[PDB]
């Protein structure tokens, strides 16, 4: 029932995109919508397939909307006839963030599924990665944010690799990858902090209502702030770093021995080589 981590296959991404540019839907005053098939049973949600849903918003500032229920229950079973294992889960709108009628219509999809999920594909990509963001609705009744991932099934491994090949990263090893992932995280951090910062401004300006529930959490962020080049920590880190030095003093070192040995072998090949060549130069 209660689920935590959400998994997504890249085919819903590309599919939804092609829905976007297929239907020419402006990214300013308009969004795209379709539904999502996958496995909702366990405490994760594996999303696999999707298909586009025709729908209308009510002029500007939509009070009402329309989504075709007949289109759904006509398509659904026409998917069942293909792979029966893919169950109708939830829907998506490609619109940057959530909206108004969202929470209203999810209640609608509770008719055609059980739990019902809503994720938002970012079609612009102009931001950083994870164009998706996963949401459910819990009581009140708002959208809880969930973690997501892009989990390539074998077929999508093959697909994405054949394609993205001409764009992938060529540096593998392990050190470059990790040290990259970090800085990527640092950039991430700096972003979130902005967000909270200027918001609080809007709190002090942007007609900040109150949200005593956020401010509490900010405080709790400070209370969790590790201070303290304390005589305690200063030792912990110190005692730890040294352990790391011992491991490094071995790896780097012995490794150097391995190069040395290899060099020796090369000199062996050269020496033997000139002997036979100079030998041949005789006749």
């Amino acid at each position: 029932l209660a689920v935590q981590k959400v998994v997504v296959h890249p085919l819903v991404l590309l599919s939804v995109v092609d829905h976007f540019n297929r239907i020419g839907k402006v990214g300013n005053q308009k969004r795209v919508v379709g539904v999502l098939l996958g496995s909702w049973q366990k405490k994760v949600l594996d999303v696999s397939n999707s298909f586009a849903v025709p729908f209308d918003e009510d002029d500007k500032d939509d009070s009402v909307w329309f989504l075709d229920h007949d289109y759904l229950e006509n398509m659904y079973g026409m998917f069942k006839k293909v792979n029966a294992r893919e169950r109708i889960v939830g829907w998506y709108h490609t619109g940057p963030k959530l909206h108004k009628n969202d929470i209203a219509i999810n209640e609608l999809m509770k008719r055609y599924c059980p739990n019902s999920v809503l994720v938002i594909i970012d079609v612009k990509p102009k931001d950083l990665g994870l164009p998706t963001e996963a949401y459910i609705s819990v009581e009140s009744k708002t959208f809880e944010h969930v973690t997501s991932e892009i989990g390539a099934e074998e077929a999508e491994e093959v697909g994405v690799e054949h394609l993205l090949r001409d764009i992938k990263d060529t540096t593998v090893g392990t050190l470059s990858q990790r040290i990259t992932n970090q800085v990527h995280g640092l950039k991430g951090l700096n972003s979130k902090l902005l967000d909270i910062r200027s918001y609080l401004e809007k709190v002090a300006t942007g007609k900040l209502p109150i949200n005593h529930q956020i401010i509490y959490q900010l405080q709790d962020v400070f209370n969790l702030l590790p201070d303290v080049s304390l005589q305690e920590f200063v030792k912990a880190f110190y005692l730890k770093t040294n352990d790391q030095m011992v491991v490094v003093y071995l790896a780097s070192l012995i490794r150097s021995v391995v190069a040395l040995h290899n060099l020796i072998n090369n000199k062996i090949a050269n020496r033997d080589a000139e002997k036979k060549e100079g030998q041949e130069k005789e006749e």
Binding site: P54, D56, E57, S63, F66, D68, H69, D70
Partner: protein, 193 residues
């Protein structure tokens, strides 16, 4: 005859909750619909209609189709004492017709007035405008208290209307039975369709 999409607007409401002639108004609505829609699908096959509920919870009660699936859909009830979503319902019915299937189908709407009809004239006419803008055919079923008339509904059919059936034609339903007989007169059916 007709190649256009239609919408059936049903108020199940303070009138529909209440028999205006057998068995209930809301029921009197029903077979009249099929009657209509039959002639609608007899007008042409492919003639499509919507079905939607307004009140405190406006929504489609079935949409798009062209055959029985509506008669299917309409089969089940509604909130019987409900209230006006008309404007919204219509504005939905408009957007409905914005997605009407395999266009070259003109936009049409058929509306039961089972509600006291609360709305503002401009909004009403903004609808009428929006319709005429969208170019919707609009005919209304109204038996109101008094009736709902000398009102929005009267301005509206006018306000929608440059050309009659390309925009609007009215009938305001009278007290008593013979609905199919009654409306046989009104350009809710026949005449220009």
């Amino acid at each position: 005859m007709v190649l256009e999409s239609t919408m059936v607007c049903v108020d199940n409401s303070e009138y529909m909750r209440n028999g205006d002639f057998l068995p209930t108004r809301l029921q009197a609505q029903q077979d009249a619909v099929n009657i209509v829609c039959h002639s609608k699908t007899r007008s042409n096959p492919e003639n499509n209609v919507g079905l939607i509920t307004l009140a405190n919870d406006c929504e489609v009660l079935t949409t798009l189709t062209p055959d029985t699936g509506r008669i299917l859909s309409k089969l089940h009830t509604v909130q019987p004492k409900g209230k006006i979503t008309f404007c919204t319902g219509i504005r939905v019915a408009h957007l409905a017709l914005k997605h009407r299937q395999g266009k070259n189908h003109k936009m049409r709407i058929i509306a039961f007035v089972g509600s006291p009809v609360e709305d503002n004239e401009k909004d009403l006419v903004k609808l009428a405008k929006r319709l005429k803008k969208e170019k919707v055919n609009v005919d209304i079923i109204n038996f109101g208290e008094e009736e709902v008339n000398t009102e929005k509904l009267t301005a509206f059919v006018n306000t929608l209307n440059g050309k009659d059936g390309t925009g609007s034609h009215l009938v305001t339903v009278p007290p008593g039975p013979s609905l199919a007989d009654a409306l046989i007169s009104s350009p809710i059916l026949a005449g220009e369709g």
